[PDB]
Amino acid sequence: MNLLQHIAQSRQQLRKSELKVADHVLNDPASVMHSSMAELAHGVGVSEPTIVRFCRAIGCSGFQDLKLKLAQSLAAGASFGQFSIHESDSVADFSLKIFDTTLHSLMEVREHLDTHALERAIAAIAHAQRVEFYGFGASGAVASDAQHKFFRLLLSAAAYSDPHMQAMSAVTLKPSDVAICISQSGRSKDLLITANLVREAGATLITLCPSQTPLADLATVNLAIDVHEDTDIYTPLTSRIAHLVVIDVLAMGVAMARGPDLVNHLKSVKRSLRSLRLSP
Amino acid sequence: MNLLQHIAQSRQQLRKSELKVADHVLNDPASVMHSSMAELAHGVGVSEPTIVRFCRAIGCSGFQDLKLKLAQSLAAGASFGQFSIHESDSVADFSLKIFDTTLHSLMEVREHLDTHALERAIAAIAHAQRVEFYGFGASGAVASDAQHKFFRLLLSAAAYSDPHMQAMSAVTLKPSDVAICISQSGRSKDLLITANLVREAGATLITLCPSQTPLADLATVNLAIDVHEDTDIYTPLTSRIAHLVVIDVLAMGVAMARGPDLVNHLKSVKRSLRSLRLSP
Amino acid sequence: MNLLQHIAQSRQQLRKSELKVADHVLNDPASVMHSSMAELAHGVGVSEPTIVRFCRAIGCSGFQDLKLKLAQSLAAGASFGQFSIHESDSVADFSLKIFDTTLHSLMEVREHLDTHALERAIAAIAHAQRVEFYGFGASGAVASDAQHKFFRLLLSAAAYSDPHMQAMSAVTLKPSDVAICISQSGRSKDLLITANLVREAGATLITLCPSQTPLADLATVNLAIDVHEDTDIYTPLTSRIAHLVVIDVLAMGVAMARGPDLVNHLKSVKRSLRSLRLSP
Amino acid sequence: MNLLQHIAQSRQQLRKSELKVADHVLNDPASVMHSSMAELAHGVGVSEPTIVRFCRAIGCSGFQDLKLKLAQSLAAGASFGQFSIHESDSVADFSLKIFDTTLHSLMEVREHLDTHALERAIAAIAHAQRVEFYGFGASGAVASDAQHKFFRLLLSAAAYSDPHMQAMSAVTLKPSDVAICISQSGRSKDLLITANLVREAGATLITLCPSQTPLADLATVNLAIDVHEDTDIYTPLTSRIAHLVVIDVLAMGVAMARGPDLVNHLKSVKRSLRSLRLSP
Numbered sequence A, B, C, D: 001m002n003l004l005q006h007i008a009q010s011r012q013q014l015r016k017s018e019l020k021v022a023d024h025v026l027n028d029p030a031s032v033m034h035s036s037m038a039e040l041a042h043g044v045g046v047s048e049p050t051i052v053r054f055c056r057a058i059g060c061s062g063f064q065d066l067k068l069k070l071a072q073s074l075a076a077g078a079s080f081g082q083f084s085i086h087e088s089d090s091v092a093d094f095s096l097k098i099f100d101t102t103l104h105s106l107m108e109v110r111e112h113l114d115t116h117a118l119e120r121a122i123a124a125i126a127h128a129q130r131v132e133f134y135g136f137g138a139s140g141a142v143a144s145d146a147q148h149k150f151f152r153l154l155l156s157a158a159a160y161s162d163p164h165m166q167a168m169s170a171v172t173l174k175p176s177d178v179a180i181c182i183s184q185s186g187r188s189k190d191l192l193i194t195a196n197l198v199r200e201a202g203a204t205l206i207t208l209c210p211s212q213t214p215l216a217d218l219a220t221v222n223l224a225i226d227v228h229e230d231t232d233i234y235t236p237l238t239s240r241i242a243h244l245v246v247i248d249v250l251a252m253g254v255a256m257a258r259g260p261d262l263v264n265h266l267k268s269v270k271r272s273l274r275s276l277r278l279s280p
């Protein structure tokens, strides 16, 4: 219920004249707040009724309600991240909102899991000699986070957010190897180049992205993580938490597939840190 | 209720003779499963009653229950991550367990937040020219994830998991600048060196770690994130999710502190990706 | 005088029929070595005289000389790097060849330096608050190497080989800031996107690449580093050494521009390493 | 012949009283330049003859020559890097000095190569499934540069400047695997921990560092790269160029060891970049 977020999100459901209003509001909400209905209509180039229909369309009671809720909407934080933050919010408010939104998104992802696709992804990785993680920006951090979990699972794990390294590494994969392309939009152009090179190498392509995206269409195994975070507009935040939890399921699954031999391997890995960390 | 996890966790609550049993069990649970009570007692060097007291101490009904629950405990995944996974679990089981455990930990962190410490951390960062994120391993990935969120907030943001880069960068900080040291154990030795250099520079040290740890003792602002994940034994997983959500609260708080000027800055940042990402 | 390298390099100077021969030879030199002149001509689809003209064109005395020098050419190393390595070479041979080639290239770069362009690059960086280094692959390593030299020079220094991070960071630059795009080909597509964003931000674009390339055409200051290494074919090696030495000149120049204040700043930086390094 | 560099370098050859003078001069050369002989002697707490003996010891003709050459010495660049830069130098001067110094150091390294140690290092890497590169700071950039050269040579290549990642990765190495620890000082404490873990894993430890250092003492194969750059005082510059050229020799050697199969592998790697780079 940040009204500016709500407007951006319902642009598609709007009549053509009303969308003109929506985009003008999104562009300079503070000028609207001090505008008359006639000024706004003239600035946007629509009729005054179109203004009021827009207001009712986005769930306001009329013009004054729009201006009131716009004023309550002007929290710089609400343009940083897709959380319903209001102008007056204190840390007590937005810290809980952020946690609650993240908890809700994770609960939704959990509810919509394609368990079969997880099984298939786990099995492909468990038979691979190499697993590679590819992504950019936020998804590049997820890639590196994943490599840190997976390197200990008795295979060779690597992560790259450099598209040239991705392409060159992808063509060296064997058909039994696995690449995981990570993308909240499924639309990063360099990543589609990389994904095609993985396919042409014969290797298994796991896509950690929403369904029906260009990236998902290339997948050997599509994990179909449909987190609703509009990262054409907001900083990716909730989306990369969901990705990391899915990564943890894949790692756990691969660990399950290893023998009892894994335990002593992991003891060795943990023992190597003794010199670097103070004892408890 | 993975019995091997439960044993490792309750070592401290045990009588001295019983702890001998605990450590022998943790070291080779499969030999115990095919041992008689007399064999085990002889192998550990304790009395047979000490065996049965150990069993009752960790909540088993007796010796046979121990062996039964040990057999149910031998899931290689349960030594990879601190999730109550059993030998027989399928993806349907451990995927939900992993999500549920993560949701629970986040709910606990949310419940225990020191809101005042958040306000103080947000305020220090909001007045800084530089914010730097320091950590190793899993906390190094969190550091880089954070730098990707913060670079857009009208300050200079950097992350380092190289301790030499950390030390050299820390001494160049001004008193108004901020460093965030990230650590699930609070005991990484190089990070304590870095934290001391931040203090000696006069800058604000924010520690994203549990309370009562060596790192927390150095903090200007201790965030006191007491996620219960034993990373001397298990892969850090749930702990780094909590850290990232706390990072998101700090970023949101800093964004709130910026003017309405931030919105157009973030529009520019998002607009720069248009050439790199397919349109929706 | 690796004949296969020599052939690839003189493709442009060749008659049309002869180029057919060149490309067939480059593709499978071992089959040529056991071919008759008539077999080769038939396989390539040219006349036998075209074979012999090709041989004389690339400086062989005739067909037998071609086959002899092809056999001497089959050193897997000579396809890895642009060094005149022969099939029979030992470490004593190719270690000196590699050093000598690198020394020669550096001497050539030194001889062709545009000293004025260096002065202008140094001056722009010396007045910047931020300097950023952008490149991919080998040039991404150069970028990170540079950031490690420059962070101590009383400005904010960053390096990115992720094109999404590059674009988002570039649009946040001020007109007084500086970006250095590093490229041996001057033709990396994502880097041209980044370079255009730097220009549109008003900032100074320094290009560390050959003259007359697409990247150089965008430059505010083109450093015109015309190292002759064909990185469409060979691993970049000599090119990135030259780039790093040029980077060192720029850093030295910026250091010269700082006050006597810099000395105590650098003492602090070096002092921060005392805990991390054993005393001498 | 930067006098301050010369003084720092000849501290060891000095009489005890004279060293007091040396360290006072190094600490505040500008106060010395405006001091009388009596003032300086009093400030340092030595006799006036000790002043003049110090001057003659470092090759000055007397007190006035010291002050003259100190004034010529105050180039902030000369404390940044170990190049004989003077206060009056222009880009034309220090660009050539930097190239010439680098060329000289490379020529010295070339002259002192232990060719046998190179052969042994090449052979160990050529039989490895994994090669890992470990270093910090400047040597961490060298490590990542190396991984970019080596990943294409039909083995698994990784680089780490995070000491925790180094330790955990090192203990997972097999005896046939190889780690290369890179260090200009040979004294980085975390790197000695990593090197010991490599030895205890049974793997081959190649040290790319000077002889007679703590790191070199651990080596399976010591490459003995005795570049004279004092990185307790100066930015590492010339040292990391030498390391990278040695890395190139090792890569070339490993490429030589691969079949003729490597050529088509490298064609594939280079072909993967076609979509990412504009055609020539």
Ligand SMILES: O=C(O)C(=O)C[C@@H](O)[C@H](O)COP(=O)(O)O
Residues within 6 Å of the ligand: A135, A136, A137, A138, A139, A182, A183, A184, A185, A186, A187, A188, A191, A231, A232, A234, A235, A236, B148, B270, B273, C164
């Ligand atoms: O930092 C931001 O605002 C971004 O959206 C970066 C963006 O390119 C992302 O993080 C990379 O994109 P995808 O995950 O491929 O959709």
Ligand SMILES: O=C(O)C(=O)C[C@@H](O)[C@H](O)COP(=O)(O)O
Residues within 6 Å of the ligand: A148, A270, A273, B135, B136, B137, B138, B139, B182, B183, B184, B185, B186, B187, B188, B191, B231, B232, B234, B235, B236, D164
């Ligand atoms: O990967 C693992 O198993 C670790 O525990 C690495 C470990 O050093 C950690 O990720 C760095 O430690 P802290 O967060 O400082 O407690």
Ligand SMILES: O=C(O)C(=O)C[C@@H](O)[C@H](O)COP(=O)(O)O
Residues within 6 Å of the ligand: A164, C135, C136, C137, C138, C139, C182, C183, C184, C185, C186, C187, C188, C191, C231, C232, C234, C235, C236, D148, D270, D273
């Ligand atoms: O590793 C190789 O074989 C490359 O050529 C990678 C390549 O894209 C380069 O390193 C990045 O290209 P530029 O420096 O932009 O010409």
Ligand SMILES: O=C(O)C(=O)C[C@@H](O)[C@H](O)COP(=O)(O)O
Residues within 6 Å of the ligand: B164, C148, C270, C273, D135, D136, D137, D138, D139, D182, D183, D184, D185, D186, D187, D188, D191, D231, D232, D234, D235, D236
């Ligand atoms: O950047 C500098 O001034 C340094 O000396 C960093 C320093 O720790 C070095 O780069 C890491 O050390 P070594 O190569 O191990 O001797």
